[PDB]
Amino acid sequence: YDNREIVMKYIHYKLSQRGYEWDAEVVHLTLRQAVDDFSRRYRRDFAEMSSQLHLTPFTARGRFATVVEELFRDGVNWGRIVAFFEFGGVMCVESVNREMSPLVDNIALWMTEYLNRHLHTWIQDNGGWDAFVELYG
Ligand SMILES: O=C(c1cc(-c2cc3c(cc2C(=O)N2Cc4ccccc4C[C@H]2CN2CCOCC2)OCO3)n2c1CCCC2)N(c1ccccc1)c1ccc(O)cc1
């Protein structure tokens, strides 16, 4: 249902593993499992991109816009929405690692606005998140 709830719960889970208690049900567990399979799949290139990412408060919004525009340029699919969430999380984990944790709240806002403004039509026309729950899990 609520896109804002889905991003809050995904980010809270990734940060809690890092020992960072950020302050801010079937779908949440299905999304969390797909993104973990996505990390295992491209673990090689995930290490490279982590260092390649030069994240600061002055570049985050622009970095976010560029990568999201590249992901969905050739259309939307669930595999790209999964990569959308993993990029949202890698930037949150990276913010915490670099002692810029205030940016977590900005990244979650950018993810929520993009889901509601640019992914809402596609998802609903796919039947909503239950359609995602049927592919994964
Ligand atoms: O540039 C990117 C990136 C990653 C993918 C992507 C999305 C997918 C997928 C696959 C890939 C993909 O193409 N890769 C995954 C990946 C994951 C982590 C780090 C690097 C890469 C690069 C390659 C891996 N190789 C490339 C050759 O063909 C496939 C194998 O399967 C399902 O959805 N895409 C892009 C750009 C737009 C096309 C799809 N990031 C990016 C962003 C910033 C800096 C560098 C790369 C990015 C976006 C979202 C993410 O969640 C992670 C990375």
Numbering used by the authors: 9 to 32, 50 to 162
Give me lines lifted from the publication on this model.
S55746 is another BCL-2 selective antagonist that has progressed to the clinic. We show here that S55746 also loses potency (~100-fold) against the BCL-2 G101V mutant and we sought a structural explanation for this. To further investigate this we solved the structure of BCL-2 G101V bound to S55746. We obtained diffraction to 2.0 Å in a P 21 spacegroup with two molecules in the asymmetric unit. The orientation of S55746 in the BCL-2 G101V:S55746 complex structure is conserved relative to the WT structure. S55746 inserts a 4-hydroxyphenyl moiety into the P2 pocket but does not insert as deep into the pocket as the corresponding chlorophenyl from venetoclax. This shallow insertion allows the BCL-2 F112 on the α3 helix to insert into the BCL-2 groove extending the P3 pocket. In both BCL-2 WT and BCL-2 G101V structures compared with S55746 E152 is shielded from the base of the P2 pocket by the insertion of F112 into the groove. However, in the BCL-2 G101V:S55746 structure E152 is in an unconventional rotamer, which shows most similarity to tp10, with the Cγ deviating by 40º from the conventional tp10 rotamer. Consistent with this the combination of the G101V mutation with the E152A mutation did not fully restore WT binding to S55746, in contrast to venetoclax, suggesting additional structural features underlying affinity in this case.
